[PDB]
Amino acid sequence: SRVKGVTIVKPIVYGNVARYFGKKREEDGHTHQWTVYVKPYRNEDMSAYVKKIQFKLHESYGNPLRVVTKPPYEITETGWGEFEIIIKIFFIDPNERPVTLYHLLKLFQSDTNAMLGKKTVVSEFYDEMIFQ
Amino acid sequence: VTIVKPIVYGNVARYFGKKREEDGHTHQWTVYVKPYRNEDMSAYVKKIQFKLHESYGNPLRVVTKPPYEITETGWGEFEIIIKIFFIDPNERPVTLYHLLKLFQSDTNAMLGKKTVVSEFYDEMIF
Amino acid sequence: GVTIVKPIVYGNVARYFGKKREEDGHTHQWTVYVKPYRNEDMSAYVKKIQFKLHESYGNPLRVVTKPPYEITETGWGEFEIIIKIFFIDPNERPVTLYHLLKLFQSDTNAMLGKKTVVSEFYDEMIF
Amino acid sequence: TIVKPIVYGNVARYFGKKREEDGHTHQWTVYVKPYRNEDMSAYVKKIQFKLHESYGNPLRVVTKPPYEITETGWGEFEIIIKIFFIDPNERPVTLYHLLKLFQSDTNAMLGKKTVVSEFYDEMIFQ
């Protein structure tokens, strides 16, 4: 006897891409450039149903609570260590509890890929968001 | 017999590599209508018009012969209304709207992609 | 009659390592896939999807039941993957698609700066 | 009553020098590919690209995708593409293509390094 609406499912990908500079940036000792991101599994404007996404970077980043309101939902920074990003998705239709994803930022590649195409690391994962 | 005909539409764009100083243009793009499957549209489509932004000279571009597409160059993103007129005058024309997409995500920039694509699928029902 | 239409894409992508990997000879990494065209839950209508990979692989009759309906491997040569699409509805007979796994880029796309082999083909599935 | 749209053209790139060994200054690739990707090899028996007489083996035949031919040379000329069908009755379609190698002047200011000359067409059946 629950009064439910229509079940609505939205498939998403999220993760990070990273690329090594070549040399230890002398000023901060940084080494990689990277973008963490959330994007639809197939091209569509998520802004129909996503108000904002926030990525909580590491405590060592200035302005660590980064937020994005309009697509692409991505944050680009540079760094030297791997750490755990906490990505919260905020829906438009309130009475829709946010979704929270933990993504371990990957910067270095596997020795297996040190032997094949060792340039650009990618770490992406599939998940789906439910509605109504 | 309710006959459906499926289509994709949208645009593709590519970065100059450097803003041209004559007109501050940074991209060339192409906006299009294509059939979902490699079939012929001309059998049932009189013309398609792509109403561009008023910044463009002659903003009402009309395509009557396939391929139903328009190639321009640009500095900015904007909405493109798309009017599909059918060959028997009875059939009501279908208006599609498309937000020209010109600027690459840092993600796709880091993956070394070279072409920005936003494309969409529809069904014209008869 | 039901008469529902669900556009899908299938095919594979491929991105050549840079060099022959000294361990198993592998030169390319690839992903053969079947995706809805729109962003939607296709497990609403798809029970499972079988991918028949070349006999040289292991468990070559790969079967995916939860989206994404993607297989990822490495290899060094091309072959033909037979894709069988099993539906939720029992009255709906499975579809079988053939796809030639493209690993080698063509001269046209090589000369354009293209960095990934993409071979994508289209279909519409009816109910 | 089947119509099949195709794209045909060439890409070329100035190689960077006048190769002194044989004079050849560009490398090009002429191709034919369906407007919307399908197994063209289901109904195309072979595709011919007849080229300038200076090229030994001037009739080149391709029989399976990618339907392209790659070469090097110094000058532009007309490539005759002939498309032969699996169905013995359907007669060969013949396309003419001005192979392009040198760039325009607004596309230099664009930030282009590769040339693209590409045309739509429709193979028609009964």
From Swiss-Prot, chain A:
Single GO biological process annotation from the record: regulation of DNA-templated transcription
Keyword flag Chaperone: no
Main localization category: nucleus
Protein localization: Nucleus
YEATS domain residues: 2-132
Keyword Transcription regulation: yes
Residues in cross-link Glycyl lysine isopeptide (Lys-Gly) (interchain with G-Cter in SUMO2): K24
Any one GO MF annotation of this record: histone binding
Region named Diacetylated histone H3 binding: 80-84
Outcome of mutating Y61A: Impaired binding to histone H3 diacetylated at 'Lys-14' and 'Lys-27' (H3K14ac and H3K27ac), and subsequent deposition of histone H2AZ1/H2A.Z into specific chromatin regions
Keywords: Chromatin regulator, Coiled coil, Growth regulation, Isopeptide bond, Nucleus, Transcription, Transcription regulation, Ubl conjugation
Gene Ontology CC: one annotated term: NuA4 histone acetyltransferase complex
Tissue: Expressed in brain, heart, kidney, liver, lung, pancreas, placenta and skeletal muscle.
Sites marked Interacts with diacetylated histone H3: S60
Source organism superkingdom: Eukaryota
Known role: Chromatin reader component of the NuA4 histone acetyltransferase (HAT) complex, a complex involved in transcriptional activation of select genes principally by acetylation of nucleosomal histones H4 and H2A. Specifically recognizes and binds acylated histone H3, with a preference for histone H3 diacetylated at 'Lys-18' and 'Lys-27' (H3K18ac and H3K27ac) or histone H3 diacetylated at 'Lys-14' and 'Lys-27' (H3K14ac and H3K27ac). Also able to recognize and bind crotonylated histone H3.
Oligomer and partners: Component of numerous complexes with chromatin remodeling and histone acetyltransferase activity. Component of the NuA4 histone acetyltransferase complex which contains the catalytic subunit KAT5/TIP60 and the subunits EP400, TRRAP/PAF400, BRD8/SMAP, EPC1, DMAP1/DNMAP1, RUVBL1/TIP49, RUVBL2, ING3, actin, ACTL6A/BAF53A, MORF4L1/MRG15, MORF4L2/MRGX, MRGBP, YEATS4/GAS41, VPS72/YL1 and MEAF6. The NuA4 complex interacts with MYC and the adenovirus E1A protein.
Free-text domain note: The YEATS domain specifically recognizes and binds acylated histones, with a preference for histone H3 diacetylated at 'Lys-14' and 'Lys-27' (H3K14ac and H3K27ac).
Protein's name according to its UniProt entry: YEATS domain-containing protein 4
Natural source organism: Homo sapiens
Gene transcribed to yield this protein: YEATS4
